[PDB]
């Protein structure tokens, strides 16, 4: 039995539809969700096996935006009985400062230029970052997983890579930010030469 | 049963001919009665003998756990040789085994740049000094941060992280005061990875 969060864009807007996934031979489970409280509400994925013939019920409750980031807790009963809990991250959310930063000058001499997006400070670590320019996402990003800093919050990097010829003429790239303690859940920087 | 676990060296520790690197062995959840077990080591599938097995030590959890620790040559372990621990119990016959080496494929040579500060990061207290190195396979790697000489231990570094075309980046943040940068002082990075020449190369940095 292994309980998963739901994604980090999912519950910052109220649009998504936020999700705790609980994922588990010849006589297969009864699925309880308890909520700090039996809830009913769950789906149940049928019974996929792999490689070594074991099978692998998935389980799905849909949470509310607001219970899952005030804290509340959520359990996984599958059936004698094996548990499980999981919630949001304890602690005053703290506000990200969202930095952008061009490519290097020795950078430059490459056929595609990096464009840094540090995002410093926030906490929990539960943050979804993006990339734009002129409103189409951009495909070609990849972002680190956050890491613990000195003073108990977080940062992370997201690198976008683009051909030089885009960044040299003038093109606008924009880092987009998603964490419980920006307003409105999101904040965006623009970069550009 | 038991459990076994085999622990590559350190980056640091084979791309320097001066220090050690070391693959160690390590059998848990041995039974306390009659705990005698075996260690035999295998470089690519023939048997060595210079492995040092610590005596076993009894857990808090009436399990005992012993400890082999392989000495490897530097260039065995970059040149890919396989390590196999094999643990041996004397009164069930049974056996584990585990192999570990270095991460298959053709090595690619890290890019260094340096990143100054956000001009929005210098209202701060604190400026943050960033290290991408980028473009490296496999993802082994050691990244260090000094000043004028002396190490600078203020930073925080990130995961390998898999990139769109099959290598590695990865950042390193190191947090100095304002003041520090802006009076003009050059900071360094270091990476010690196994497709640099001498396993070495450094950037600066300054206002
Ligand atoms: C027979 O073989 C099968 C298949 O190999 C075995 O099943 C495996 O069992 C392992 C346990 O023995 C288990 O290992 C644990 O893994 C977790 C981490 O799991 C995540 O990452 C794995 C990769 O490392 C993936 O394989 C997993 O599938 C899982 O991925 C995440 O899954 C989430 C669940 O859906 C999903 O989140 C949801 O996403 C949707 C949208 O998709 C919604 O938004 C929803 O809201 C979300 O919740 C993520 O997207 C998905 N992400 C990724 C990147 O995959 C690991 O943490 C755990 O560690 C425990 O123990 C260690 C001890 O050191 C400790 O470090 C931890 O703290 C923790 O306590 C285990 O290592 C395998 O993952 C699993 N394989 C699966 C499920 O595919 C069977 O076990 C074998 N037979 C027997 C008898 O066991
Ligand atoms: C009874 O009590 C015993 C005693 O604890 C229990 O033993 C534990 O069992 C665990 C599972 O059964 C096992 O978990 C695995 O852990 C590894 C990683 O462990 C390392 O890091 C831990 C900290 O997070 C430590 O607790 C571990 O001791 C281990 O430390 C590493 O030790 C290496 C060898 O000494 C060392 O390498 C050397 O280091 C020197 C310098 O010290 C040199 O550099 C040299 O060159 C190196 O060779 C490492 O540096 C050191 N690492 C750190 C970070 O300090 C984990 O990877 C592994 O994950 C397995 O499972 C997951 C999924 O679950 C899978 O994804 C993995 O791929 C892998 O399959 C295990 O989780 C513990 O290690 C172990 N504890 C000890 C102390 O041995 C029993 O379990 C108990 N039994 C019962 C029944 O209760
Ligand atoms: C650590 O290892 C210990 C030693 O392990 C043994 O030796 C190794 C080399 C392997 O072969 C391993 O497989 C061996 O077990 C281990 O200790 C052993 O543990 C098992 C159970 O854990 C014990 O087996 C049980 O023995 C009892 C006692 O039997 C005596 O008493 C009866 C009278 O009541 C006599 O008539 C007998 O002839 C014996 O002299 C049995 O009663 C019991 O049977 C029960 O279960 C069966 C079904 O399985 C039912 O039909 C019965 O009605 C009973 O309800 C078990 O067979 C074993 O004796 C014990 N031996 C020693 C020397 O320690 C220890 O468990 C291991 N520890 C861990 C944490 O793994
Ligand atoms: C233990 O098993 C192996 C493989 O079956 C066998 O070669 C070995 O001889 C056995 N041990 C003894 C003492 O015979
Ligand atoms: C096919 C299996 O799927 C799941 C993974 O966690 C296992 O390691 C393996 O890849
Ligand atoms: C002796 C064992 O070794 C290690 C610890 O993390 C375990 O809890 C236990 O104490």
Not at 29 to 57: G, I, L
Not at 132 to 157: A, C, I, M, R
Request: aromatic share 10%.
């Amino acid at each position: 039995v292994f309980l998963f969060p739901p994604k980090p864009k999912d519950t910052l807007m109220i649009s998504r539809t936020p999700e705790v996934t609980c994922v588990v031979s010849t006589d297969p489970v009864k699925f309880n969700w308890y909520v700090d409280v039996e809830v009913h509400n769950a789906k149940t994925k049928p019974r996929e096996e792999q490689y070594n013939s074991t099978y692998r019920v998935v389980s799905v409750l849909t949470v509310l935006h607001q219970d899952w980031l005030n804290g509340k807790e959520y359990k996984c009963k599958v059936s004698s009985t094996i548990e499980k809990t999981i919630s949001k991250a304890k602690g005053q959310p703290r506000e990200p400062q969202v930095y952008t930063l061009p490519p290097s000058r020795e950078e430059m001499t490459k056929n595609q230029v990096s464009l840094t997006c540090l995002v410093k400070g926030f906490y929990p670590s539960d943050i979804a970052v993006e990339w734009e320019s002129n409103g189409q996402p951009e495909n070609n990003y990849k972002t680190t997983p956050p890491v613990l800093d000195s003073d108990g919050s977080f940062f992370l990097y997201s690198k976008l890579t683009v051909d030089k010829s885009r960044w040299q003429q003038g093109n606008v790239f924009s880092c987009s930010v998603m964490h419980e303690a920006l307003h409105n859940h999101y904040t965006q920087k623009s970069l550009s030469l």
